[PDB]
């Protein structure tokens, strides 16, 4: 039983399985292991029939003893989190867990840390150093960093990215060790807790005078921020709780095409709530149009929805309906 | 003695081919499983 | 030529021609070209500039700010040295090291050196110090040690005073179409003990021949007569007394127990006085030996 290293035995298995199966195994391997067995099959020697048989038999035993679970190890987490705690908390926990697999070098920490901090850190860096740093990072992160530099340095870094010639290994190792030493500060992970969609939730609560003053102040400070806050403030769900008379009034103001486009993205409960109030002919033709018209881009649906939201706001300012968080109890 | 050796070699290669088809089926069934098995192998070279 | 002298008129006229230093500079330039070929994987050509022996403040005022100032120690010589890497040269070296071909224009606006550029400068300085020590080994062996680096000329203070005379040696580094400069600056007091060695190189066979020459010199100077003057006594007088002085007067004097014998005023030995053979004689008690 010749001193057949386990790496070379794995190389034997990869050779025996086939090309597509080898690619499938490669897709589930880490980079260091990929390079290791790539070198192993680069300096591969001949394998005897008996040693081949022994290796593949012991691999059969290992596969039989270990094969279990591994159904959707990654997708299962996403599906369970989305089903249990909603999309936003699912994404938050997914980011938290996928961040637990730490970097080995600070260069990848530059990928996981806020773009403003990166721009502040590497602005003083050498333009070629900036180029080398930006190449290793994710494309979106590099774009975010570059969007903060001034025009001259940004153009210089872009030009150097275009004509990169290849960094020496020792210099790259020194740069990596410098980044590791500097980024050795315990944890960056600036907690995302709080922000938009929470301010609107708060504003939905207090007195009309206070909230109108607050939104006026925000609009004075920033019009787009105020518009976003107002848009999140209402949310296109509580129209089911604006009762039937509001729907009856609203259909006197909403065009048919905008309503038809908007109802495509609406939930079945909201669609039924809107349909069940008007005349049979109107509800029937609206349902037939909804079932007949083809799919429409989401942005157009949101545009029509925002138009009817403007209509709703202009009609509520007149007091023709009541928009209340408190559910209308019927006895 | 030569014919016995050659037929023994033929039987060995036939069995190797058959169970190699078995590996091919297993790999197209659970490539993640064969991948984590070879992960065990990579971890245990160092022991 | 009758002009009123004023302070800060450092008309320091110390003109010399250190041929040995020029030879050492050429050897160091060759060694540094080999080192840069090893490092950058490109072949540079370095032109050795004329040795500028100028006051320190004048040297510092011409240095661009910021710049890489590397303090070095030239053991066993007392004092500290300086190795200057101009921002252009460090720009070229870093650009070549980190994948850039250098075809882009050199854009030096003025900024401090980060840690990565500090590592690159440290590598270049190690190579340069090795080359400098190797060059100096042919004449006088020294050990060169890196101490620290500074970005401002005020943080170094290489000499005691800004008017002290210093030796500066500029080298021009050329790589393709990119030009860079770097300087080696040594205080003149560092090489003052080695002034006679640095001035004249006209010797190639000197390990034991130096000892033979020194032995010949000492054994041949031992055949020259001197001027031994023994001051018997020391009488202080006023100039009126000298003018009024007449023969026959007696001058009081504190009693000299020990007679000091000097040569051209330089004290040499102290002795008791006496008479032998009818001549004044001195019995030596202690030679003047620091």
């Amino acid at each position: 039983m010749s001193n057949l290293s386990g790496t070379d035995k794995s190389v034997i298995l990869l050779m025996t399985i086939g090309e597509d199966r080898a690619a499938e195994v490669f897709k589930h391997l880490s980079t260091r292991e990929v390079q290791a067995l790539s070198t192993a099959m680069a300096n591969v020697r001949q394998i005897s029939n008996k040693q081949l048989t022994d290796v593949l038999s012991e691999f059969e035993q290992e596969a039989e003893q270990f094969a279990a679970l591994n159904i959707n190890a990654n997708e299962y987490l996403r599906s369970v989190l989305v089903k249990a705690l909603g999309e936003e908390r699912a994404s938050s926990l997914l980011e938290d867990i996928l961040e637990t697999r730490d970097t080995t070098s600070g260069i990848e920490t530059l990928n996981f840390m806020e773009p403003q901090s990166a721009a502040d850190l590497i602005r003083d860096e050498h333009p070629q150093i900036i180029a080398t740093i930006l190449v290793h990072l994710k494309r979106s992160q590099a774009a975010d960093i570059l969007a903060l530099f001034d025009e001259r340095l940004r153009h210089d870094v872009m030009l150097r990215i275009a004509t990169f010639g290849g960094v020496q290994p020792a210099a790259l190792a020194e740069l990596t060790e410098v980044l590791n030493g500097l980024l050795d500060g315990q944890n960056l992970k600036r907690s995302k807790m709080g922000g938009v969609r929470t301010a609107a939730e708060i504003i939905n609560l207090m007195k009309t005078q206070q909230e109108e003053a607050v939104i006026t102040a925000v609009r004075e400070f920033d019009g787009e921020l105020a518009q976003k806050i107002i848009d999140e403030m209402f949310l296109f769900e509580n129209l089911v709780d604006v009762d039937d008379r509001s729907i009856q009034r609203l259909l006197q103001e909403v065009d048919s095409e905008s309503l038809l486009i908007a109802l495509k993205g609406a939930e079945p409960p909201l669609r039924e709530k809107f349909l069940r109030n008007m005349s049979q002919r109107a509800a029937d033709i609206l349902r037939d149009d909804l079932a007949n018209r083809g799919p429409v881009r989401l942005s157009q649906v949101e545009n029509e929805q925002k138009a009817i939201l403007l209509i709703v706001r202009r009609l509520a300012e007149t007091g023709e309906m009541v928009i209340g968080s408190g559910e209308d109890t019927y006895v | 003695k030569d014919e016995q050796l050659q037929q023994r070699r033929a039987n060995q290669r036939l069995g190797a081919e058959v169970m190699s088809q078995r590996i091919r089926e297993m790999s197209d069934n659970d490539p993640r499983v064969v991948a984590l098995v070879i992960r065990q192998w990579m971890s245990n070279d160092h022991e | 030529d009758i002009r009123p002298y004023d302070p800060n008129t450092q008309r320091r006229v110390v003109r010399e021609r250190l041929q040995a230093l020029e030879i050492i500079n050429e050897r160091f330039a060759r060694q540094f070209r080999m080192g840069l070929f090893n490092l950058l994987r490109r072949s540079p050509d370095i032109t050795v500039g004329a040795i500028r022996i100028q006051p320190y403040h004048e040297f510092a005022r011409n240095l661009p700010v910021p710049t890489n100032l590397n303090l070095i120690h030239l053991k066993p010589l007392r004092g500290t040295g300086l190795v200057v890497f101009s921002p252009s040269l460090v720009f070229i070296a870093v650009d070549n090291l980190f994948g850039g071909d250098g075809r882009f224009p050199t854009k030096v606006e003025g900024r401090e050196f980060t840690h990565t550029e500090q590592r690159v400068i440290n590598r270049m300085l190690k190579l340069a110090l090795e080359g400098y020590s190797d060059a100096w080994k042919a004449i006088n062996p020294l050990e060169v040690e890196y101490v620290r680096s500074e970005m401002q000329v005020k943080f170094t203070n290489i000499t005691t005073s800004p008017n002290d005379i210093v030796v500066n040696t500029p080298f021009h580094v050329e790589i393709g179409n990119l030009t860079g400069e770097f300087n080696i600056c040594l205080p003149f007091s560092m090489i003052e003990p080695l002034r006679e060695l640095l001035v004249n190189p006209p010797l190639e066979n000197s390990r034991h021949e130096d000892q033979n020459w020194r032995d010949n010199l000492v054994r041949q100077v031992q055949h020259s007569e001197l001027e031994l003057v023994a001051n018997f006594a020391d009488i202080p007088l006023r100039l009126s007394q000298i003018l009024k002085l007449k023969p026959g007067d007696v001058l009081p004097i504190e009693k000299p127990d020990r007679i000091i014998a000097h040569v051209d005023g330089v004290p040499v030995l102290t002795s008791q006085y006496g008479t032998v053979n009818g001549q004044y004689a001195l019995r030596v008690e202690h030679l003047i030996n620091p």
Binding site: - | - | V221, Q222, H223, S224, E225, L226, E227, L228, V229, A230, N231, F232, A233, D234, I235, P236, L237, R238, L239, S240, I242, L243, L245, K246, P247, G248, D249, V250, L251, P252, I253, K255, I259, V268, L269, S271, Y273, G274, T275, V276, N277, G278, Q279, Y280, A281, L282, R283, V284, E285, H286, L287
Partner: protein, 81 residues
Amino acid sequence: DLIMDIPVKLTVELGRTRMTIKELLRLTQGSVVALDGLAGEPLDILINGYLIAQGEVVVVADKYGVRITDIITPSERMRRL
């Protein structure tokens, strides 16, 4: 006129000799060196290295002192030049 004080340094020289560096380096403790000046020959007196007079050591009431036997002249000064 105003130079009547100008404190000066009168020195008397005991003798001079012609000796090479060999003996001088080889002079030791207690070794005796002779001078060209004969005993009883009046000593020489100088000021800042220039001749000023010729004097002889005399005993005056337990206090030995120098007595100027002669004041220099330009003639003898050139003779001793």
